[PDB]
Amino acid sequence: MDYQEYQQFLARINTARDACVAKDIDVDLLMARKDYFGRELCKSLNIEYRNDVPFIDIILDIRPEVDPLTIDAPHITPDNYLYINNVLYIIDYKVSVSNESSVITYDKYYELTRDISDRLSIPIEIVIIRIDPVSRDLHINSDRFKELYPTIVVDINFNQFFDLKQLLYEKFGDDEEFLLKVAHGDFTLTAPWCKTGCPEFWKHPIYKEFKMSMPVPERRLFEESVKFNAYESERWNTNLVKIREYTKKDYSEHISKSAKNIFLASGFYKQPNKNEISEGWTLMVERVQDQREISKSLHDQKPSIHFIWGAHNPGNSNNATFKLILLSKSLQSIKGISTYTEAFKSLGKMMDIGDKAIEYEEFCMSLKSKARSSWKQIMNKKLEPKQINNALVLWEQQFMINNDLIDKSEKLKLFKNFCGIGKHVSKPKILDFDDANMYLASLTMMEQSKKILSKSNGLKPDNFILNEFGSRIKDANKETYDNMHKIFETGYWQCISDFSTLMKNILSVSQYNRHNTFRIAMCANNNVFAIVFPSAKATVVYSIIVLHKEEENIFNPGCLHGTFKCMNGYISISRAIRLDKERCQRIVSSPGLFLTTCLLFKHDNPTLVMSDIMNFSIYTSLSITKSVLSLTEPARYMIMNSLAISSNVKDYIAEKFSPYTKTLFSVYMTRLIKNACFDAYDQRQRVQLRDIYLSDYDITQKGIKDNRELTSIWFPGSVTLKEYLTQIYLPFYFNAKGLHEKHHVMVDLAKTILEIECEQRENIKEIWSTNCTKQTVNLKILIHSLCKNLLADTSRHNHLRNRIENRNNFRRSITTISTFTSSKSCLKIGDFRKEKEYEMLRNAMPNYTDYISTKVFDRLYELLDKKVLTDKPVIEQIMDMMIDHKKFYFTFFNKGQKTSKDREIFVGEYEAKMCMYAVERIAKERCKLNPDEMISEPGDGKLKVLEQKSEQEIRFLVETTRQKNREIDEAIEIEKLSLGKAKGLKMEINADMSKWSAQDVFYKYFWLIALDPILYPQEKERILYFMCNYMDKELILPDELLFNLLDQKVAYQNDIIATMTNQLNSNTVLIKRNWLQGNFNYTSSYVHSCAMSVYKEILKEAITLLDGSILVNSLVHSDDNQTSITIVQDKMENDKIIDFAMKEFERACLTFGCQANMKKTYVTNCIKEFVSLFNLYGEPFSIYGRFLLTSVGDCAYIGPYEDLASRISSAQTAIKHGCPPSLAWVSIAISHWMTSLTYNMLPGQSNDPIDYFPAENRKDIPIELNGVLDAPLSMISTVGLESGNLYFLIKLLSKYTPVMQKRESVVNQIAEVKNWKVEDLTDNEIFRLKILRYLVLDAEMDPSDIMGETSDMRGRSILTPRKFTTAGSLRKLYSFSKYQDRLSSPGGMVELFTYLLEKPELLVTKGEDMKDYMESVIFRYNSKRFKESLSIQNPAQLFIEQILFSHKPVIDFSGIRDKYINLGKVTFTEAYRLLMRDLSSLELTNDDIQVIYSYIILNDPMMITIANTHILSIYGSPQRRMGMSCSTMPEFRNLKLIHHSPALVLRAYSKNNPDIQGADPTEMARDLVHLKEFVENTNLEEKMKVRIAMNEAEKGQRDIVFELKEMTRFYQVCYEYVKSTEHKIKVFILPAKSYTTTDFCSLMQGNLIKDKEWYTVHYLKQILSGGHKAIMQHNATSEQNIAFECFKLITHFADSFIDSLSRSAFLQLIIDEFSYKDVKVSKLYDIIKNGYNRTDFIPLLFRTGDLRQADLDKYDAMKILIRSLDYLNNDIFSLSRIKVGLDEFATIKKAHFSKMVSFEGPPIKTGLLDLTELMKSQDLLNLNYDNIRNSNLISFSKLICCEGSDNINDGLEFLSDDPMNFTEGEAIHSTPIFNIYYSKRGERHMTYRNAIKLLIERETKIFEEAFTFSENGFISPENLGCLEAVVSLIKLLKTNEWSTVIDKCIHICLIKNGMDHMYHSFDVPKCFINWVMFREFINSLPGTDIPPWNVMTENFKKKCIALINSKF
RNA sequence: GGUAGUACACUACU
RNA sequence: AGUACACUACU
RNA sequence: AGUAGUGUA
Ligand SMILES: [Mg+2]
Ligand SMILES: [Zn+2]
DSSP, rough: HHHHHHHHHHHHHOOOOOHHHHHHHHHHHHHHHHHHHHHHHHHTTTTTOOOOOHHHHHHHHOOOOSTTTTSSOOOOOOOOOEETTTTTEEEEEEEEEHHHHHHHHHHHHHHHHHHHHHTOOOOOOEEEEEESSOOEEEEEHHHHHHOOOOOOOOOOOHHHHHHHHHHHHHHHHHHHHHHTOOSSOOOOOOOSOOOSOOGGGGGHHHHHHHHHHSSSHHHHHHHHHHHHOTTTTSSTTTHHHHHHHHHHHHHHHHHHHHHHHHHHOOSSOOOOOOHHHHHHHHHHHHHHHHHHHEEEOGGGGOOSOOOOBBBSSSSSSSOOOHHHHHHHHHTTTOOOOOOSSHHHHHHHTTOTTTTOOHHHHHHHHHHHHHTTTTTTTTOOOOOOOOEEETTEEEEETEEEEETTSSSSHHHIIIIIIITTTTTTOOEEEOOOOTTTTHHHHHHHHHHHHHHHSSBBOOOOOOOHHHHHHHHHHHHHHHHHHHHHHHHHHHHHHHHHHHHHHHHHHHHHTTTOOOOTTEEEOOOSSEEEEEEEOOOOEEEEEEEEEEEESTTOOOOOOOOOEEEEEETTTTEEOOOOOOEEEHHHHHHHHHHHHHHHHHHHHHTTTSOOHHHHHHHHHHHHHHHOHHHHHHTTTTTHHHHHHHSSSEOOHHHHHTTTTTOOOSSSHHHHHHHHHHHHHHHHHTTGOOOOOOOOEEEEEEEEOOBBOOOOOOEEEESSSSOOHHHHHHHGGGGGGGGTTOOSOOHHHHHHHHHHHHHHHHHHHHHHSSSSSSSSOTTOBOOHHHHHHHHHHHHHHHHHHHHHHHHHHHHHSSOOOOOGOOGGSOEEEEEESOOOOHHEEEHHHHHHHSSSOOOEEEEEEHHHHHHTTTSSSSOHHHHHHHHHHHHHHOEEEEEEEEOOOOSSSSSEEEEEEEHHHHHHHHHHHHHHHHHHHOOSSOOSOOOOHHHHHHHHHHHHHHHHHHHHHHHHHHHHHHHHHHHHHHHHSSSEEEEEEEEEHHHHHHHHTTHHHHHHHHTTTOOOHHHHHHHHHHHHHHHEEEOOOHHHHHHHHHSOOOOOOOOOHHHHTTTBBBSSSEEEEEOOOSSHHOOOOOOOOHHHHHHHHHHHHHHHHHEEEEEEEEESSSSSSEEEEEESSSHHHHHHHHHHHHHHHHHHHHHOOOOOOOOTOOEEEEEEEEOEEEEESEEEEEOTTHHHGGGGGOOOOOHHHHHHHEEEEEEEHHTTTTTHHHHHHHHHHHHHHHHHHHHSTTTTSSOTTTTTTTTTTTSSOOOOTTTTOOOOOHHHHHHSSHHHHHHHHHHHHHSSSSSGGSSSSHHHHHHHGGGGGGGOOOOOEEEEEEEEIIISSSSSSOOOOOBBOOOGGSSOOOOEEEEEEEEOOOOOOOHHHHHHHHHTTTTTTHHHHHHHHHHHGGTSSSSSHHHHHHHHHHTTTTSSSHHHSSSSOOHHHHHHHHTTTTOOBOHHHHHTTTTTTTOOOBBHHHHHHHHHHHHHHHHOOOOHHHHHHHTTTTOOOOHHHHHHHHHTEEEOOOOOOOOOOEEEOOOOOOOOOOOSSSSHHHHHHHSSSOOOOOOOHHHHHHHHHHHHHHHHHEEEEEEEHHHHHHHHHSSSOOHHHHHHHHHHHHHHHHHHHHOOOOOOOOOOEEESOSSSSSHHHHHHHHHHSSSSSOOOEESSSSOOOOOOOOOOEEEOSSHHHHHHHHHHHHHHHHHSSSSSSHHHHHHHHHHOOOOTEEEEEHHHHHHHTTTSOOTTOOOHHHHHSSOTTHHHHHHHHHOHHHHHHHHHEEEEEEEEEEOOOHHHHOOOOOOGGGGGGGGEEEOOOTTEEEHHHHHHSSTTTSSSSHHHHTOHHHGGGGOOOOOOOOOHHHHHHHSSBBEEEEEEEOEEEEESSSEEEEEOOOOOBBBBBHHHHHHHHHHHHHHHSSSSSSSOOOHHHHHHHHHHHHHHHHSSSSOOOOHHHHHHHHHHHHHHOOHHHHHHHHOTTTTOOOHHHHHHHOOOOOOOHHHHHHHHHHHHHHHHHHHHHHHO
């Protein structure tokens, strides 16, 4: 941890050049890690630190009286010992990831100490403390030791040692001897998976083709390699080395040629520019005109928004019946003649209620009351229309189509030519997007929309989002709050809210619409209506009707049918719209999308116009068509390529960009993109980089400058680069998934697949070539690279085969693998004609391969039941299937993604799944070792990897450039020399691969299989036979696609499908070279990595020819490549290098069969983009807008709480990806609004709970009771929706704890709960506490409990609606048929249930046996929810059903009442009322409050830590986020009590045998003991037994299913208790790098409070608590950390800012009276003295005496006499630094000065400076000399306490005169130009005192000339009289900080001028209490306009005038 | 020409 | 209604 | 363990 020791290790690594000493380096590194952990553990435990203390020594120490030689002490050396309570504990520190060494050392030490334990009559305990370096989880075996130490708070980081190990291994990676020397064990191969290999593989036609393709020597080499057995051979790498040596000549020749190409390359690469963009645009428009039908008519446009809107009418009433009457009258009174005017008038007559409004209301109310009285739908009773006036009414807003009221001809005209009901190869018609008239029409449309919608609403901006989240959003960003207020005031919000409400009403009324009825939908607007036409994927037909007084005052986005005159104005009818419920639901959610988009685009940008942003967002948010889809996604490639250094944007536009402009908005956005391309080319040079700050240990202040110089894209303004990237990339997420149509997408996907297959069949005939032919692989280079990479990878780890089998469950059963037991679909081949009934297709097409789709688990059940599969180890069965399954069949379906063209998705059969599983797991485990591979990297860690690569490339650039240009810089401190100096080049190739799986040479994987060392020859033969049979796979065409292709009746021109299928005579097509998408990810990625390694070699050699330095980092996921190249050379310009690098990148991709997408491949100098993730310049960046937009996404629609928890997930992910707090809060508000809208809980609505509960606002109601979340954003991110209860409890603590403990730790504050008075609690608090006590917890719980259930062990759902829903067909499931047979079997259920009781662990864990699996599969069918999931369900239909059933009795209140002490289903409102009634009778007591606190907070260490962070937080100096970084969330529960896996522990507990398969005998015993203790102390077994007994007695018969359910919850709780370290991968973008839990919490809290700036957070006490997950914590930690921080801060502050002489007196004075963090510093000093950590404060102790020479001896042991020390420190006056020897220096570690604000004490008055305020000073404590000398007199005036000082020179004497540090910045001279700033030791003239002197002189001169009221000067007697007047004035009035700072500044000026005597003699002038003339004088004050004091003097005068006027 | 089972949401500062 | 890589919810 | 959702390729 020590930085000097880190430097020492770095020097050892750098200077080392022998692999024999690198082992010494690594061993020393491991010892340093162990000793560091031991020292930190001893500090935490507060025990004296020892290492390898002799056992005889410890025996003598514990028993000095006994004579030595009484017994031979064992030679073992314990790390440390501890003797308390007559028990000796032998402690051993271990820093390992495993327990093998721990257990063997435990056994050895125990055996060797038994004899001494018996003799000396002392029990000896062997305690092994083990820490896991990668996840800091502590493991302790001795429970007695853990009893001694209840809280162990070891919080340390091992990242430094990992970095050194990585540096050593990368330096000596090329040395195979070093790898062998550091290898663990030898090369070991497990037992062969198969006993025999395929003999028919050699006869396979595919193998014959491959063999004939290869030349003869390669055929021989392939046969030898596949027939090679590593275990039999003397060396495993015998054949690998032979092949590598054979191919070395060709490999070296290829590398040398490719390197020689650098000279032949010119400087001209594919630069994007305006000419290329224009030519590409011309080619694109030509291609689009050829492929489409271009229309120049505006009347051919399609609706941009399927809606028309008009402002409301304040004069008219908003009652529903009045609106209906008004609509009927307006429809009837249409004047004029038109096509449908008579139909509209007839409809208005049909809906004419007349004057019988009361009768209509009564009829509708009676119907609704009848409907709502039943949980189920009312059946068998027919609704009969009632005639009211001329209206035949069936329901509210439902009317008959009366044949008498409408002519038949008019009715058919309307229904067919208008609504399309009863209605009934050319090119798709699209508008001309390049036509000037068409673009002018689009501009006119957008201008009209802006004009109509920019006006004010005229109504209150009050709404749910604002009311419930305005405070949070305002505190986060007042500007965001103001933007929201403006948005809600404008008319865009009213229009989109009206459209959403109206569309929800349309969806509600369309469910029960009949064929002869039409519905009327109404919204809050009294002028906007909807008429829903009859309808039967369900569709909705609606027409929007708008009433407006003035014509042309309507908002028409190309949806209007016509505007007609009526009574009292005009009526406008929109054209009929037919939409899918999926698009309708998006429209309903659209307000959230609109608000999110507007706030994202406007955030932190004053140069943008909110009107323009909303004008764009209203169209993108409501876009539900493919027209905008065709533009959003290609825009990324177009604009990003244009900004790039090298890109083929011209070819991209010409060949791929295909705008689909069916709408005027699409035309407008096409023009926007076109302009943005040229602008992006023009403005690529305005990107600038921040000044890098390098500390040589970490990088801070890195990235890209924030200057708004780039032009905005979609709307006028200026943006930063980050905002520009957001504007480029966010629009892709405006698209909607599932917009495609199955018919067309199946046709296109089949066409693409068959076209690729046909092209491969015809054109592609060569497999191996040397000239980089398309779809061809260079054989020699491939083989050589594969050999090299395989050698390196398998040399890295010696047990690769064992690791594969262990991690992939190869040795375990088939039923224990998730991918083989899932509910995903799989293909089944065979005769299934009966189930499928299709008949016509079967008869008409002979060669039809019959197939059916089934679930994976069902297929596994079938194969197990038919004995095709067994429960033997899975790998043996997999290889058996590799031989048996000769024919592979696949089918495909469309993904339905959000891109313009859908993606084909392939489904395979079970045997193919298993074979590919084996191959892919082998490839995966070899990819894990390779650093370049990125699929093996867990998700979201790729951001951290990108950051690390960028940081090391920055460091390499700086170091290499400085090292090379040292000579030139020395010569400078010449222009000709500067010309010839070396320059740095940085290159980022963000690349894409074209047709990764479609066009790939599958033969290159044969070599990967054959050259693999870890496989046996028989395994290789079987796998190669599988691959050969895979290359003969057949694609089964889908039945629906075949149906449509057979129902055409007109022959297609060139039907590729018919050609490939023999004129539709077969449904199967043979696919050979296209390994199917997604099946061979790891293998393809490995070969991609090998290709990039060859590229790296080529680049390194080529740069070697240039005598330069290069660093190449390549990241490869599957087909997405991120290659960054850093070059520092001087021979040639950068253009030649860029051209050469790009040409060789393309050539290297083509060499290995890959093909880079040059259209989508672009080169940048700074920006990295690997997988939707960006690294701007060392600084991580991500588009969190996608997570922000997914806040309104679909959910399970289970209930109000379940729905909310799903969307808070998206909010939290957005927070993790860098979303600012205000936008995160907006997303949370939108999620709450969406849920409340779904369940009709919005304010004022029926299910709104605010009235029924004692709460002022919905923040007071619990989430489970339908409140809104109220908690800090850091809490929401960390604990995740438990934050509601946590925040409520913390607020209760902060409100009711006594003042003495108010600033104590959470455990102490909870211990003080017994003193609470329950009578003082408010009604809301009482209600919430009762809810927590009785609804969340159990009545049996007692405050005396020591262990209890954690919040993760219990659910939170209370009010969940129930639905009467049919299960579905489920006919095709063989397992379901077996389950039905078993159910119909006599009593089979009792046996199956009995088996599940006998093996209860099967309920929660996977079974390890076929019988166990088959029983579980049969059992799951009992649960209704599983069957519902099995049936396909539409989320759109579920959402509408939840809306409709909101008033029906759905809540089962019996279950809720069963929760507390001791009917029919109930509605939401009645449930609220009943819950309040039930809770009224219950009582609450201090005992109950203690139970709540103990069971909610004291259980979880994470909950305790979060509560401590909230209570004890101190917020420091604000600062702008300069350089961000990634940091993963650490583990909050470090202590581990269970070692074994939870499944194994549960299996052992179900039985009583600690000895289980795969379970360590003795290790499982303690886990079983712990689990039994947990069960007994929580009384789970007793509670379950009592519950089942009571239920059995109540029912009268044994409810066996109830017993199963009880066992399920019991084992669920047991599983949650015994769950081990999950170690989730959760990374965060944070202002700084965090290493420990406290650092992470500080960074989270400081980052998630304000949008503008982030704060430094330190904690008053120690936040972390040492405890276990389910054990109560009643012990708080010590204050030693506070003492350490205090005295480190004190020593270093005194050294830095105090003169050498005054330092000791300063220390003594501050020790005597001051206090740190509410703790007296004398007490902290006593803690340090009377403690076992005194070697960290040797200089501090020396200055205060102490030492006693024991500390010096201990320090020497860590590596010196007292008098020698005293003599040596004669010249040194440093409090923090002392010299024990002539060169040895004992020092105290530094602490950040931001914590100095925690010191409180009496003033330290010396000279005129009061040092207390200096410690409290914020500006003047900075270490940099420049920053100190450049501070202001406003800050400096705080330190002035003169009381009669004459000279500032003697006043400032009490300041440090040692040299300070200053930041010197230098340029780098690289193609991306940037400056690095590094602090360096300054010379003598720059000291703290000198900086203060310069500050004083400059600022006082400025202030003097600012306040020379008289012309003579500052010292003139008249000016002095004016100063006397002003000081008397300010003394006479109330003190203000303006007055104080002005007084201090004038005082310091007078001290400089030596006017102090009169200053202290200032009094009221004799000419002056005439307040009138004081006012006259101050109003006559000649205030100057000097800029710093201009605002200051005016404010001071104004405040004085206001105060003196308020006085009178 | 005839036929076309199918119980309910919003109801608002507008 | 697929492979993989995750994350978060509910039972 | 099952189910749902989201992001990624
Ligand atoms: Mg890419
Ligand atoms: Zn003074």
